[PDB]
Design a protein around this ligand. Structure first.
Ligand SMILES: Nc1ncnc2c1ncn2[C@@H]1O[C@H](COP(=O)(O)OP(=O)(O)O)[C@@H](O)[C@H]1O
Ligand SMILES: Nc1ncnc2c1ncn2[C@@H]1O[C@H](COP(=O)(O)OP(=O)(O)O)[C@@H](O)[C@H]1O
Ligand SMILES: Nc1ncnc2c1ncn2[C@@H]1O[C@H](COP(=O)(O)OP(=O)(O)O)[C@@H](O)[C@H]1O
Ligand SMILES: [Mg+2]
Ligand SMILES: [Mg+2]
Ligand SMILES: [Mg+2]
Lengths: 52, 473, 505, 472
């Protein structure tokens, strides 16, 4: 019974660690996503002021 | 006075260049009517090219454009018919009715572009609008004279929601309405007109209450870009001279800004403001600012915002997010569950949703229902991953009541009988609040959740409960 | 500077100050890259067909005061500077009629199949305006494409513009061809109301690909009612740009004659690219992603032609099936967003489901059909409502299927039903299924009869079920095909048949 | 009277020539200029006007003055054609790159000809037993069709081309033509030496391959038009000789790159991401001139260099739609250890049919794709959620997919010095049987490293036995 309790407590801890990893990965990749989508705006700016 | 005329020198797709004589050069945003064999074509100036030449955008199909043809100026922007006679008739951006039912003998004729109301005329709206839909009457009440936004993607039911709004408002309010079809599909347009005819709002042999300013996407980009301001002109003419509350319905503001960027692409219009259109701020503010609750009347602008795969990074949806005051997002996921209205109870906020404006009881009921549904989707994940039995009894009661309320959100539309077959239910805001309070109070917890589904009032709830009890056994 | 220089450029480079009567004639000042600039042609119309001295046809898109911009209908080798040009006096047209069926034609209507000449009941303008707002009817006649998923959750009706948007090598043209093959069930009959004539556009498509497509159509005897309008990438960009409009006129001939036609706009991105090339060569102001200005207007003018005519106009229908190729699944680009905003429906073929073997991999989560159940068989609508509900539930619970943890019994049942239905909607290439066949499997899946059957054996279950229904319960299939509605007795008989079959596996 | 012109403008690889007569040379005409170091050929691109046209330089504009005499041939650029070109290096202008004397070709066909019509399209679904596991399994190659080798920089595109040449051209039997479009001259020299050693090229006798080199050192016009020259060689071999042509076009993306090159200085408005506006059309005629006709067949084997490994780039994206068989060499697998790097998902071919490769082959290919897709979907799950925190069935599928990915690696004879393992070949039936046995779980206990750098299942079991013996 205590082994089950410790196993599920460690499961909660490991899934909390995985949740933190997902959170910081999502934060950095959302910064990257914003950077890339803004780079699309820079690219459309440059090709409009060059072509037109 | 001699008519002001010139000769066409260039036609680049939808862009036509016309040369005028000395002192014959007109102003921008004017009308350059050219007698075409395929009806009548008129061009609107965008910029002066010098050498007595004007760069214009075709307001109608550019078939048959020849350099040197005699194009006569109308002395200003192409005046569209404005008045009570315009009700029940589809009017395009060029003022030539596409219903072959005779010319609109309007009281007056106003240009599309006009000076927006002054800063003093601007005011806030704090009056409840009865729309006949329970969920949006309670959780996100409409504002009489405000700017409403009907967010939603594809297959979510925006245009049908707009036409249901027009039908319910016309039934429950005698004020005239206008529906501008910016970027409106022709098949969707025929559906809209058939629904208007069958709902009684448009009466061919009598008096109507809605005028269509259909855009007809297959016309050149200028028509799509200017049908919105044409419908806005209709709305302000109805507001000022008649002195009555009117209902402006934008078909798709996203299509309007797309057409603005498009017509920018045809012309020079080096995009600087947002990236795809440098003028976008100018004409966007000129349009939105013109819907204002002036001292003559109030214009409620219900615009539909289409977000493609939640493209919130683009400035275009954010610009519309800045204009409006109360949102009615129509997320598809809710419609996939069975509640075809698809309006999200927690994401459709209202500026005037406060005890001081909508009422203490109304605000309390709306807030409690929103909290119950928020707990519903908060515990839905654990219910799915674990089950229902382990959930606490208080949370069990809350989730059951939230399921009942969510079924209650779906309401029959008088405009949806051609697809559902269920007669529409025109509910009242007070009736909606009373029914929601009674359901949330637990007096009808024993009633199955299917009873609240696809019904109107609580009497309809118990009627469907009896019907489903009979069907089951 | 007492005398500043302010001049920039002028299209006039040879001072003549005499010579006249160049209203109908002209001389090519500059020509290259498939386009030409000609001084003269004062009384020429916008994109009016113009004949060169070398025999190569042209189109007058740019009409600047200095010269008229002409795009060539082929290579620029035969045309040189200063060559005499003459007006044809008419716009570009395309032969149309019932004789186009059974033949493969060029974008200009020339028969490239090589099996003789072309016989057409008449000639129609390539650039024909879309039908008016009043002469239209609500889309209510369904188009039976044959694949279970598209027929059920994203149905297509006659006169409905449904976009098949997908990544490369996802099967968009496969879905189109499967629809064409399914149309042979009624195209071989006698009632023209149920007959769905088919036309195909091949713009930016390989000539070898077109040959393979027409060979496949001939193998299934579906080429007889199919018209192949091929504008290969080898041909000039104006030809590729004009092919969809000529095929739209071809379909409009059937639409105005009271017949039902189905047009598939394959590779609309290729047409957009060709128009971009034409505009950039013509020095027209470029727009978003360097695309031309009037590209959304082009797509709207092309697509709004296809619709369902009213009864007073012959009750004809032209069904549009546009196909575009996304770049890495990015639906946020100019052409994808435009085409999605134009067409009523957007069928989503994403490569991720294809890699999962859904095949044709219709992303029901993103696929949209605005017409919906209105233009659908009543029995098909009945099964498809429950099917869509169950797929929505599976999609909102599909994450736990990947997790595979200790889930709730109801959630496990919903996940099992959803995965069984996804395996059920899987079909094979060039294997259409009629509604009489499709409806029983959808009903069995939504009723929970597929829960016992293993996921890997869903295809065997399907094949054996069609065999059993075509052998024993043939009257049920005939009733479903004829009546089109599942009555209470019909539903009970079908459920009994499904129970017996699942008992016998 | 020969047509004579005078050079007016020289802008890098773009030369402007004016003709003092009404007889203006047509587009794509060959304009030869007598330089002190030899002869410079110019190909007309556009008619700018005022009796002046714009040309593309076939050779570097070294010492080009304004007003230099220009002579018009009268037709497009003509290169020697026939059996004489076999075993000889062919330049873009047709002059023999090799120093083995001139070419005594009977005819000199122009490099600009109309593509075969739709009627003369003899499509076929014939298989091609290349000998590589992954391509023979997932994207079977079509005999007489068009062949793609998409990949980034340093992914084995040239190595794959050389391996395919070694595997097929030796046993091809019919004629072939290798076309180097904008590739390193050192690689071309290595390929020439290798095919000389293997007997494909016989200087003193009969050679089965004709070499056309437009190497990446050459000016942009030469890079653009060497593909056309090699295509003309292949077309003549297919039509006149009536033989199955094994066209090996190397770095076909360089054709579009040179088109964009000349387009910037030609006055054309740049297309998306800066490419030439006419990319689609010109590559359309170039690629559609390769097709299987009734006279014969040209089995074009093209390698596409995708810029920045971005498959959404317009040139590779449109080449995807303008090609039958696709073999994507993703860098993410190239650096993963499986340097064959053939991504098992986007590498698709039209031969994937139950009636073409057989029902068993189709089922095997579908199942291996399913396993690898499960692996890709659960990549993040293994990454940060945890491999052990997974269901038994999902874990088994992931292990099977990893074993399959390791098995996809195959040593190449041309890459023997690279991988360090002899380049054994595997037959299609052997690959199908081995993968079917693997999918059944008969080799689950065998470690994943046994499938590394092996051929058939016999190689797998031999490697497993040797690793068990050495590890104990
Ligand atoms: N409340 C509703 N009741 C019945 N049918 C609806 C409802 N909402 C949407 N629909 C159906 O869904 C389709 C959506 O069409 P439309 O609203 O024009 O496009 P979108 O959903 O993209 O705004 C309509 O054809 C309509 O038949
Ligand atoms: N039901 C199906 N079963 C198996 N494969 C399919 C199915 N539908 C489509 N495909 C695959 O899709 C491919 C066709 O893609 P296609 O539409 O030609 O893409 P593109 O038009 O971008 O070239 C074929 O190679 C075929 O293998
Ligand atoms: N089977 C293999 N084993 C080991 N290394 C390989 C193998 N195949 C290719 N390589 C490596 O990949 C490189 C080939 O890069 P490549 O993709 O040809 O670049 P590019 O496409 O720019 O020519 C070679 O330098 C070689 O070292
Ligand atoms: Mg809509
Ligand atoms: Mg296709
Ligand atoms: Mg390389």
């Amino acid at each position: 019974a205590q082994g089950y309790a410790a196993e599920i407590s460690a499961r909660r801890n490991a899934m909390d660690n995985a949740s933190k990893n997902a959170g910081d990965m999502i934060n950095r990749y959302s910064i990257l996503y914003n950077r890339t989508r803004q780079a699309v705006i820079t690219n459309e700016l440059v090709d409009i002021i060059t072509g037109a | 006075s001699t008519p002001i005329t010139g000769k066409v020198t260039a036609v680049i797709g939808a862009i036509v260049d016309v040369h005028f004589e000395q002192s014959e050069l007109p102003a921008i945003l004017n009308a350059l009517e050219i007698k075409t064999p395929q009806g009548k074509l008129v061009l609107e100036v965008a910029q002066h090219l010098g050498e007595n030449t004007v760069r214009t955008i075709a307001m109608d199909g550019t078939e048959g454009l020849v350099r040197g043809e005699k194009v006569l100026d109308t002395g200003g922007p192409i005046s569209v018919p404005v008045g009570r006679e315009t009700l029940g008739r589809i009017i395009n951006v060029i003022g030539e009715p596409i219903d072959e039912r005779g010319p609109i003998k309007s009281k007056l004729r106003k240009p599309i572009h006009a000076d927006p109301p002054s800063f003093a005329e601007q005011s806030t709206s704090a009056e409840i609008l009865e729309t006949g839909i329970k969920v949006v009457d309670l959780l996100a009440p409409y504002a009489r004279g405000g700017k409403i936004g009907l967010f939603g993607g594809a297959g979510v039911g925006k245009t049908v929601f707009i036409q249901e709004l027009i039908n319910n408002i016309a039934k429950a309010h005698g004020g005239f309405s206008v529906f501008t079809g910016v970027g409106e599909r022709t098949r969707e347009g025929n559906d809209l007109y058939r629904e208007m005819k069958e709902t009684g709002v448009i009466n061919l042999e009598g008096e109507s209450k809605v005028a269509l300013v259909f855009g007809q996407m297959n016309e050149p980009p200028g028509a799509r870009a200017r049908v919105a301001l044409t419908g806005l002109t209709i709305a302000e003419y109805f507001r000022d001279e008649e002195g009555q509350d009117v209902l402006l319905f934008i078909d798709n503001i996203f299509r309007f800004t797309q057409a603005g960027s498009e017509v920018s692409a045809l012309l020079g219009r080096i995009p600087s403001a947002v990236g795809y259109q440098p003028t976008l701020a100018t004409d966007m503010g000129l349009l939105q600012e013109r819907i204002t609750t002036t001292k003559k009347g109030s214009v409620t602008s219900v615009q539909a915002v289409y977000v493609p795969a939640d493209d919130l990074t683009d400035p275009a949806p954010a610009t519309t997010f800045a204009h409006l005051d109360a949102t009615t997002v129509l997320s598809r996921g809710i419609s996939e569950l069975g509640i075809y209205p698809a309006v999200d109870p927690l994401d459709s906020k209202s500026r005037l949703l406060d005890a001081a404006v909508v009422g203490q009881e109304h605000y309390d009921v709306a807030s409690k229902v929103q909290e119950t549904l928020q707990t519903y989707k908060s515990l839905q994940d654990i219910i799915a991953i674990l089950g229902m039995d382990e959930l606490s009894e208080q949370d069990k009661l809350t989730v059951e009541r939230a399921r009942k309320i969510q079924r209650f959100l779906s309401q029959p539309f008088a405009v949806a009988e051609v697809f559902t077959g269920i007669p529409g239910k025109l509910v009242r805001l007070k009736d909606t609040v009373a029914s929601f309070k009674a359901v949330l109070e637990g007096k009808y917890d024993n009633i199955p959740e299917h009873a609240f589904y696809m019904v109107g009032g609580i009497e309809d709830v118990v009627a469907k409960a009896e019907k489903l009890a009979a069907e089951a056994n | 500077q007492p005398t500043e220089v302010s001049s920039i450029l002028e299209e006039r480079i040879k001072g003549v100050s005499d010579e006249a009567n160049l209203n109908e004639t002209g001389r090519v000042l500059a020509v290259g890259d498939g386009i030409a600039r000609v001084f003269g042609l004062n009384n020429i119309q916008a994109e009016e067909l113009v004949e060169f001295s070398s025999g190569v046809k042209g189109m007058a898109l740019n009409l600047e005061p200095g010269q008229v911009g002409i795009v060539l209908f082929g290579s620029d080798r035969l045309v040189k500077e200063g060559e005499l040009v003459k007006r044809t006096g008419n716009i570009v047209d395309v032969p149309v009629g019932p004789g186009l069926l059974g033949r493969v034609v060029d974008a200009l209507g020339n028969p490239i199949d090589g099996k003789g000449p072309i016989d057409a009941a008449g000639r129609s303008r390539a650039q024909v305006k879309a039908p008016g707002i009043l002469p239209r009817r609500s889309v209510h006649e369904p188009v039976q494409t044959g694949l279970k998923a598209v027929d059920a959750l994203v149905p297509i009706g006659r006169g409905q513009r449904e976009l098949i948007i997908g990544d490369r090598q996802t099967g968009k043209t496969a879905v189109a061809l499967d629809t064409i093959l399914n149309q042979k069930r009624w195209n071989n009959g006698s009632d023209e109301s149920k007959k769905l004539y088919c036309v195909y556009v091949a713009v930016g498509q390989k000539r070898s690909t077109v040959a393979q497509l027409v060979q496949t159509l001939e193998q299934h005897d579906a080429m007889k009612y199919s018209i192949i309008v091929a504008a290969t990438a080898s041909e000039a960009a104006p030809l590729q740009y004009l092919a969809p409009f000529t095929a739209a006129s071809i379909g409009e001939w059937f639409r105005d004659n009271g017949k039902h036609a189905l047009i598939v706009y394959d590779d609309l991105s290729k047409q957009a690219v060709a128009y971009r090339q034409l505009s950039l060569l013509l020095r027209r102001p470029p727009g978003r992603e360097a695309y031309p200005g009037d590209v959304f207007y082009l797509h709207s003018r092309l697509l709004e032609r296809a619709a369902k005519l009213s009864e007073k106009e012959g009750s004809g229908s032209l069904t549009a099936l546009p196909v575009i190729e996304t770049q890495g699944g990015d639906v946020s680009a100019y052409i994808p967003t435009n085409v999605i905003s134009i067409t009523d429906g957007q069928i989503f073929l994403e490569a991720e489901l294809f890699y999962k073997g859904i095949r044709p991999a219709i992303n029901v989560g993103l696929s949209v059909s605005r017409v919906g159940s209105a233009a659908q068989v009543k029995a098909l609508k009945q099964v498809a409502g429950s099917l869509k509900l169950f797929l929505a539930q599976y999609r909102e619970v599909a994450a736990f299927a990947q997790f595979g943890s200790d889930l709730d019994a109801s959630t496990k049942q919903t996940l099992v039903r959803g995965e069984r239905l996804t395996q059920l909607l899987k079909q094979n290439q060039y294997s259409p299924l009629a509604t009489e066949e499709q409806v029983p499997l959808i009903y069995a899946g939504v009723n929970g009869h597929l829960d016992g059957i293993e996921l890997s054996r869903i295809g065997e279950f399907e094949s054996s079920f069609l065999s059993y229904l075509k052998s024993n319960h043939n009257e049920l299939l005939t009733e479903i095909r004829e009546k089109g509605e599942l009555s209470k007795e019909l539903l009970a008989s079908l459920k009994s048949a499904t129970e017996s079959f699942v008992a016998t596996f």
